[PDB]
Structure 1
Amino acid sequence: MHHHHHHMSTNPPPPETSNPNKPKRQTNQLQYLLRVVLKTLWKHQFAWPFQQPVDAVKLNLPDYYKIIKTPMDMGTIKKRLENNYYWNAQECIQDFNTMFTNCYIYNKPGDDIVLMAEALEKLFLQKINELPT
């Protein structure tokens, strides 16, 4: 009897940051999303949980990827922007919204992590209120 001692929690593969077959563009709005929006959010005191895929193994959150089926994080977004992965600003904004929404789904109002996401989302909405063009 192994008692399933060898079945251990693992993280899923991270989201793709490059797809040569995906249509992509460099737009002023996407350049701004990288240079202004992401890079100021990245420097925020609360950015650190969001700077890379949730590592459910390290955090001992074995239920995270049971609950969250569309993970997203700013590290993935930053790579996508740097790799010219996106067709338009709205695709990138959708990834930000997914990142915040996942946090609110998995956690509860008043949790430290949710207060962090709320603060970043406030700054995010302030920054994207006006894009180029």
Structure 2
Amino acid sequence: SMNPPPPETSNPNKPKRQTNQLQYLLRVVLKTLWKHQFAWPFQQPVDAVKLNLPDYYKIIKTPMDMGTIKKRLENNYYWNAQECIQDFNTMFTNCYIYNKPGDDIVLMAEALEKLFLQKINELPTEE
């Protein structure tokens, strides 16, 4: 069994930007979620080999995780905050698609997602 290559965190053909919203997304949103009690299963790409999940990358074709998002934010990979918010939303969506309602991993995603939504409800106005 093989894992796909991870999502890219650098691309010299992609224009980069730093905005107050993206720095809020790193300094407040990512950092808070990273330190959460249930953040461990989301801090790196799903290793479907080691977790013996051979259908995972059969079913999930846009994988995403907070390790990738952290590296994208640290590298200023994004142009705008919506790009980064979409990556979080994809991470959560994948978990809910692949797993079953009420699974442990889904209960953990639920907690992180509730905090995520509280933080982006207060996304600062673009300056």
TM > 0.5 fold call: yes
Structure with greater Cα Rg: 1
Percent of residue pairs identical:
99
Cα separation, 1, equivalents of 2:34 and 2:96 = 19
The corresponding residue for 2:21 is 29
Give the Cα separation in 1 of the matches to 2:25 and 2:87.
12
Q: 1:131 deviation in Å?
A: 1.5
In the TM superposition, what is the alpha-carbon distance from 1:132 to its structure 2 partner?
Answer: 2.0
In the alignment, the residues of structure 1 paired with residue 47 and residue 4 of structure 2 have an alpha-carbon distance, to the nearest angstrom, of 9
Question: Within 5 Å, which residues of 2 pair with 1:1-133?
Answer: 9-133=1-125
Runs of 4+ in 1 over 4 A off after TM superposition: none
Shift of 1:24: 1.5
Deviation at 1:130, TM superposition (A): 1.1
Relative to the length of structure 1, the TM-score reads 0.93
Residue 36 of structure 1 deviates from its aligned partner by 0.4
1:57-102 residue CA offsets vs partner (Å, 9 max, x unmatched): 1111111000000000000000000000000000000000000000
Whole-angstrom CA distance in 2 between matches of 1:70 and 1:59: 18
What's the secondary structure of 1:52's corresponding residue? coil
| Distance in structure 2 (CA, Å) of the matches to 1:88 and 1:19 | 15
SS at match of 2:14: coil
In 2, Cα distance between the equivalents of 1:17 and 1:43?
A: 21
* 1:21-66 residue CA offsets vs partner (Å, 9 max, x unmatched): 1112100000010000000000001100100000001111111000
| Mapped partners of 1:99, 1:126: distance in 2 | 17
In 1, distance between residues paired with 2:83 and 2:112? 19
Displacement after TM superposition at 1:20 (Å): 1.0
- With the length of structure 2 as denominator, give the TM-score of the two structures: 0.97
- State the number of aligned residues: 125
- What CA deviation, in whole Å up to 9, does each residue of 1:81-133 have, x standing for no partner? 00000000000000000000000000011100000001100000001101222
